[PDB]
Write a protein that binds this ligand. Structure first.
Ligand SMILES: NC(=O)c1ccc[n+]([C@@H]2O[C@H](COP(=O)([O-])OP(=O)(O)OC[C@H]3O[C@@H](n4cnc5c(N)ncnc54)[C@H](OP(=O)(O)O)[C@@H]3O)[C@@H](O)[C@H]2O)c1
Ligand SMILES: NC(=O)c1ccc[n+]([C@@H]2O[C@H](COP(=O)([O-])OP(=O)(O)OC[C@H]3O[C@@H](n4cnc5c(N)ncnc54)[C@H](OP(=O)(O)O)[C@@H]3O)[C@@H](O)[C@H]2O)c1
Lengths: 306, 299
């Protein structure tokens, strides 16, 4: 078993990481680090620094804290000789992820930038069906109530928190996986409430290298049922991904999919990467978001109320 | 020699590119493309597609148009089997540059993303002196008066349009990669790009690298990079033309940024290599992504 530590025991750590780790036989949950939480049955620390100082035989760390502290924690873990798994986004900047990848490669360690939505069951079936066909247009709708997915959370509204791109980048992680050709941003509009620093809604107009238009609408102002949809119009009809990747229809016919197991799949991949002595750092979804911030118009809207 | 075409004959093509090409023996200027300008002594076209269709023996092209039109030109040139040299910045977005580098690598073609300020006289001496030494801190001060439209449009970079030149020097002289830790963009309420900006970086050894860019009226114009080491301060001034080390001024040669660029482009084509350093643009992108934004009075 690979000995594993988890950093930042918050919403996604309780909802997804700890259950997936517990059911993954390749890992032994050995330690956890959190300022305001502890995990029963394992050794607990207030911060990653104290965990690394004490857990010299630990093999790997998985980071579930906000992305603004991701670089500092991942660098420390890599410098201590641990393989590192990163929640999405892999960093607040592209430069820090490049530095981490070079460092992990400069230490022979596994670095894994995870995109949990890429492990949704519809993703690889969609990629396989689309690799052969003539794509005409792509439509993305990724809208959910922020208060239901990040209740009480403030880092989403601070610089490096991405705002609506925090879930929106999941859609881009799927699109960049299922489309055969690279995307380039052509225009973007970011809608930023008067009281925050990140967008609550955004529109993206991209094209792949063949000129296929990729239109995306992200919104955190929404009712209680998510709209997490990607529609690829082809010459053979429409491929429609819905429910964040849990549902797939091709030319109007539903497609049978296995059960959702995104985070089990992530941890299985992390273990396999370590046993292979390989890394997996795809920053293309974050690079497109960076282009959106660099090139995109910014429009003020009314206060969110944080 | 290498047959060469130039696209976008503006003032910098007239002042810098064409004289440098004329004096570079490795190239023969064969054709130029420009919508509103013709170049004496060579064949002339109004767009790159026409040039490419006609100049079938052409080996390479140098693109001097702004980045908003350069990506489509660079694609067509690489697809036509030509080596490509790009003015700075190499793209309007990082995705554009990634596409070109993949395209060039797949056809075995030379792609050269130039940073003309990296060829200023002080840059390579500063890099040699700093390579071995214990650096403590770096400070960049870029200030000027903007009063002396694309710059205020979404994607126009704002103060980073010239400020990225200082970032290309910083990233060349320092021996380790920079990570942006905090940024602040000051945006006039009637524009979409920053008039002033502060960057807070740290290199991979933790060395703080601070940069301030200001386009507003204030104190006297300045362009300075100061790198404090255990052996004293290294100071670059005058956009890279002037160098001081531990208080001692250093003798530098005349400015030949664009002759240097074209000599390197020729050398890249000879060795079959590319040179696509996107890090100065990536740092600017990180500032737009990670930066805190502050509104100021209309411009
Ligand atoms: N919310 C979701 O549904 C979801 C789903 C998939 C992926 N994710 C990703 O997972 C990451 C965290 O998401 P989340 O919803 O779990 O947010 P979160 O609960 O608010 O943050 C997780 C924990 O990180 C710690 N934290 C906050 N600031 C910190 C700081 N400076 N330094 C160290 N620890 C700090 C906190 O634990 P302590 O106070 O105890 O130290 C926090 O409880 C994000 O990158 C997010 O994008 C979220
Ligand atoms: O430094 P610069 O000077 O701004 O370079 C601009 C030059 O490249 C060309 N240019 C500017 N905008 C262009 C556009 N949309 N499309 C094609 N060429 C453009 C122009 O040459 P031409 O106007 O002669 O094409 C211009 O003289």
């Amino acid at each position: 078993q690979v000995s594993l530590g988890v950093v930042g025991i918050g919403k996604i750590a309780r909802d997804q990481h700890l259950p997936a780790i517990d059911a993954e036989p390749g890992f032994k949950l050995t330690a956890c680090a959190s300022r305001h939480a502890e995990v029963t049955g394992v050794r607990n620390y207030r911060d990653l620094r104290a965990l690394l100082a004490a857990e010299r035989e630990l093999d790997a760390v998985s980071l579930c804290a906000p992305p603004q502290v991701r670089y500092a924690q991942a660098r420390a873990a890599l410098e201590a000789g641990k393989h590192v798994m990163l929640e999405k986004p892999p960093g607040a900047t592209l430069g820090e992820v490049a530095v981490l990848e070079a460092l992990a490669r400069e230490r022979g360690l596994t670095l894994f930038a995870t995109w949990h939505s890429r492990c949704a069951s519809a993703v690889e079936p969609a990629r396989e069906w689309l690799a052969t066909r003539a794509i005409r247009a792509v439509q993305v709708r990724w809208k959910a109530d922020v208060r239901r997915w990040h209740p009480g959370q403030q880092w989403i509204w601070e610089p490096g928190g991405l705002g609506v791109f925090d879930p929106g980048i999941n859609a881009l992680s799927i699109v960049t996986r299922i489309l055969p050709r690279e995307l380039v941003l052509r225009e973007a509009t970011l809608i930023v409430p008067s009281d925050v620093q990140t967008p609550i809604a955004a529109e993206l107009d991209c094209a792949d290298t063949d000129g296929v238009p990729v239109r995306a609408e992200f919104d955190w102002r929404h009712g209680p049922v998510e709209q997490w949809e990607i529609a690829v119009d082809t010459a053979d009809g429409v491929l429609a991904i819905s429910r964040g990747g849990a549902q797939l229809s091709i030319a109007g016919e539903p497609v049978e999919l296995g059960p959702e197991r995104e985070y089990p799949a992530l941890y299985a991949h992390f273990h396999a990467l370590i046993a292979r002595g390989e890394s997996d750092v795809d920053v293309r979804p974050l690079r497109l978001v960076a282009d959106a911030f660099l090139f995109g118009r910014r429009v003020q809207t009314d206060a969110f109320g944080r």
